[PDB]
Design a protein around this ligand. Sequence first.
Ligand SMILES: Nc1ncnc2c1ncn2C1O[C@@H](CSCCC(N)C(=O)O)[C@@H](O)C1O
Length: 371
Amino acid sequence: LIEVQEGKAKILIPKADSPVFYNPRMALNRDIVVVLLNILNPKIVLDALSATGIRGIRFALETPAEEVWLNDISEDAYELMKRNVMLNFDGELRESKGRAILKGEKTIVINHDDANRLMAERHRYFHFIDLDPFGSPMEFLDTALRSAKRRGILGVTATDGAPLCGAHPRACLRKYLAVPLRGELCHEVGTRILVGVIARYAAKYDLGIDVILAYYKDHYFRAFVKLKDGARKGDETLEKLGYIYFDDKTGKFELEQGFLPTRPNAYGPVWLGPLKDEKIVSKMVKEAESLSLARKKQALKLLKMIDQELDIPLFYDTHAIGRRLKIETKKVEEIISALREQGYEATRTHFSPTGIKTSAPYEVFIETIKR
Ligand SMILES: Nc1ncnc2c1ncn2C1O[C@@H](CSCCC(N)C(=O)O)[C@@H](O)C1O
């Protein structure tokens, strides 16, 4: 074991294929959720697959959370979780049958079990649940949707982007029950597929969702949603689902709002609603600035990008469209300036370095990008 620091937390990680997983590259992901929790202030929270326990520990040390649950099915992880918790908190970690509880300023509950089992035991109990598995979160989604309060918050990560970006079509259908789209738009389509599957699974509980923040980064998808209580709210949520049509020869996309598509070659279903709560994300940029984060600079760069990013379905990739149409194109910075000069909204997007979010119709965009 070796000592490592992330944010205000000091933890021990196995030195090495490792007995307990820890990825420092995910410190940024952790920072983001920490920043968000400092805005929404959920009291009772769950770190469902904590591994070393770093997430829940940071929740306890850096957010207003009052009761923090850390869980993992692995005995090795559980043992390390207890050790790392006592490395950051004083008091008596009372253990009994695979569960250790510390009742200090903040109450910490370390659990050893299947996340589905723990969440089933804690029905309508958490104000916030963070699902951060190895790959897909689908094995845990339905139960989390029952474990969180009817107005709770859900944080979901999908690490395997192969099915979501269209590389593995078969798997995407099986796991997300949606038809993926490969290419320059896959980072967003995959993100919208994730939000859409959450909305779809939630509906049967007479719950709807409002997206707080959903983004893509370094080959992983993240989505934070606020559960809405009510059948009608569930109805209205499903009405925000839709499909995407994409022309491989031009890069032009079409949107179709509706539970089912009505034309061939449709992609989805996907969430066609907003991918961010403008006000909350605005506050997040400010909060990240007044907080001691693990990767403050990277956190702010991503948050600022998303904050200024136009929230509209999809975008146009200058490089990709140039290739599909077989034409020379202008630089992104120039194209944005030109679009704005013509009276159209246009911004860069975190989904792709060469992508441009704009209100401009496809044909106006093409005429603008042409060398
Ligand atoms: N059914 C299950 N219930 C609870 N944990 C599970 C599980 N199946 C797999 N896991 C596990 O999930 C892992 C995902 S790695 C997770 C990391 C993280 N949440 C962070 O920020 O560090 C392992 O620690 C592990 O044993």
